[PDB]
Design a binder for these strands. Sequence first.
DNA 1: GCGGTTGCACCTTT
DNA 2: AAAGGTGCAACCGC
Lengths: 45, 45
Amino acid sequence: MATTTLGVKLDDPTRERLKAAAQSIDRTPHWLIKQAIFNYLEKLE
Amino acid sequence: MATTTLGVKLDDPTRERLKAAAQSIDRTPHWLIKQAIFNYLEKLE
DNA sequence: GCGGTTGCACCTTT
DNA sequence: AAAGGTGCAACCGC
């Protein structure tokens, strides 16, 4: 993966939700950010 | 929706797929960036 | 101008 | 305190 830092726009409550999801999947929030978008494409294919 | 510019890491091909997905949903790539992540949480709830 | 990209300032966690 | 994770503003590309 060559995940570069991009200017993605996220909401405040959505931020916490993403961090909470990270705990559920047993992954670090920083890692989960990349996984969330990547898995999004994985779910629909 | 108060989507603020945050530091999200995205891969090159992932970015292109995001744009391609935007075309499928009939939305502008700029809008789809924040919609994809938001919809991700919407799909799993 | 709009869309997207980069590095760094600041807040969170060990 | 430090390292990791995060927020914001600026610049280049289309």
